[PDB]
Amino acid sequence: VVALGLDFGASGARAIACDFDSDRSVSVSVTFPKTSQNWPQVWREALWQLLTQIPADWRSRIERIAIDGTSGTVLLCDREGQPQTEPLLYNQACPIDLADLADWVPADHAALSSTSSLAKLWFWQQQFGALPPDWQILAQADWLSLQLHGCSQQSDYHNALKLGYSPDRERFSKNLLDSELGALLPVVHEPGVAIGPILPAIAQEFGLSPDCQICAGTTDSIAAFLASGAHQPGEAVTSLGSTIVLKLLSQVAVSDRLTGVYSHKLGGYWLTGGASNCGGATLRQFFPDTELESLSCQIDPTKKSGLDYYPLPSRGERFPIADPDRLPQLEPRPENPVQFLQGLLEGLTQVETLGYQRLQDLGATPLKRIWTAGGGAKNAVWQQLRQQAIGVPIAIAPNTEAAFGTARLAAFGLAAFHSA
Incomplete structure (x- = not known):
């Protein structure tokens, strides 16, 4: 089995296509700028850049793809996954009251942080006043994998943790789902499981097998641990x-x-x-x-x-x-x-x-x-x-x-x- 790993980090992105029966691999890189008026465009172009630099042989042989991103970097998108405002990066804190999140997660849940995805969603909520139900909040890894499989509102229980997910019970709280933010929450899978096949147009453009599967991603911090074995x-x-x-x-x-x-x-x-x-x-x-x-x-x-x-x-x-x-x-x-x-x-x-x-x-x-x-x-x-x-x-x-x-x-x- 030949699998592709896409890592979007703090200041760049790395792609590693690995053949696991040969234990042989190829690695390519893309370096981000330190400032952008359009980070989504930077990330998406990085994605196509990474795919392009991979040799035609490997690309034809890739059967599975997964993407890890920075934890806490989120995008407010509409029905089609189109950015409606600037992404709130992982390092950015939000001037909100954490007491406004108390009824959506347990006592000292990880989401209770001014830099969490949930806090940023609530910040967006108090910003726009009222968020449309057909809109979606997507982590970096989520949004990027969406560029590959086209399935909206899909995430993993690593990225979704600081959005308010409870992987101990495998669910968002009923109060959060019933909330006004509920319709923007993603369906949460286990990292690694297949979300869906790669988009036909994407597969054809980059010379990838149309039967290639796009999996649920992770955070780069967790991907680093998974690299150890x-x-x-x-x-x-x-x-x-x-x-x-x-x-x-x-x-x-x-x-x-x-x-x-x-x-x-x-x-x-x-x-x-x-x-x-x-x-x-x-x-x-x-x-x-x-x-x-x-x-x-x-x-x-x-x-x-x-x-x-x-x-x-x-x-x-x-x-x-x-x-x-x-x-x-x-x-x-x-x-x-x-x-x-x-x-x-x-x-x-x-x-x-x-x-x-x-x-x-x-x-x-x-x-x-x-x-x-x-x-x-x-x-x-x-x-x-x-x-x-x-x-x-x-x-x-x-x-x-x-x-x-x-x-x-x-x-x-x-x-x-x-x-x-």
């Missing part, structure tokens, strides 16, 4: 990037609105996680990468530095423990740059350690092993510190590209996420 509960993917992002697979859904912790449904399992303000950005504040490496070579993890740092890049922390007033803790600062670096890596290690423990304290399945992604994943000293402090096998994630995880999503769905 981890499917057993207790397994976790750690992203050692600018910020440390933890993703833990569990048999139980856990949530903590205080620390921004919530859970996505993933087949029969649950994907929980948390994001710290700490990360490699703190490291770059004192070292360039080259110097960072030359100094890491001289660090022996088997001996404590005596330093107890909390490596925030600035004031404020959100996970594992929430404290907006917490300041970075980088004292005492030794004269030896090597040992100061060790203190930093030890602090970042503690963040990850306390992060996974916090997740387990909330009820998540105990950590079995860790797959690592991001820039710090290649840092073996950092890996040793993480390993000896956490106590589980830690390795580098085989694949990390979101488009590849989405290609796997197209090829196999979420089938691996069940009891064997």
Whole structure:
């Protein structure tokens, strides 16, 4: 089976066509601008650009397609899926009262956030005054897949979560559906399942098989986890990037609105996680990468530095423990740059350690092993510190590209996420 993964991220889009019986693939890219008067046009043209750059052989052989997008990026469209106003991007917050959403979702549901799809739909509602029932709100991944299969008001329970969906009960609340916003809500499927065949005109134009299936997509954050291949509960993917992002697979859904912790449904399992303000950005504040490496070579993890740092890049922390007033803790600062670096890596290690423990304290399945992604994943000293402090096998994630995880999503769905 040959599947195509389309990933639309923060500043670009990547396509990965993958042949899974050959384990061979091709990857193409499109880079977004940093400003547009028409982001829908930018995204749609990116879609055709990605498809075009794929060789004719692969395109003829593609049987399934899936698309992941940025979580919280939504479009207000009419009956035909035509943008009626500018998209509200993932980073944009809305000046609405979250108390106006209380009757549509449970106590501290993930949708209760000024940046959620639901909050943006309510913002649009109070903007236009009254939204027509034949209109629809679409996530980025939704709208793009709509360009492929032509079926309107279709989404997945990953993107739809922050729209107010409850994947624990597999439904929107009856009060939300009965509401004035109800007619704009999409039909929610499981990521990976076939929505419908590709549009005949689209298939013919781009030399794709007319029998190719367009699946239900995901978020790019979840696609990244799917790229690792981890499917057993207790397994976790750690992203050692600018910020440390933890993703833990569990048999139980856990949530903590205080620390921004919530859970996505993933087949029969649950994907929980948390994001710290700490990360490699703190490291770059004192070292360039080259110097960072030359100094890491001289660090022996088997001996404590005596330093107890909390490596925030600035004031404020959100996970594992929430404290907006917490300041970075980088004292005492030794004269030896090597040992100061060790203190930093030890602090970042503690963040990850306390992060996974916090997740387990909330009820998540105990950590079995860790797959690592991001820039710090290649840092073996950092890996040793993480390993000896956490106590589980830690390795580098085989694949990390979101488009590849989405290609796997197209090829196999979420089938691996069940009891064997």
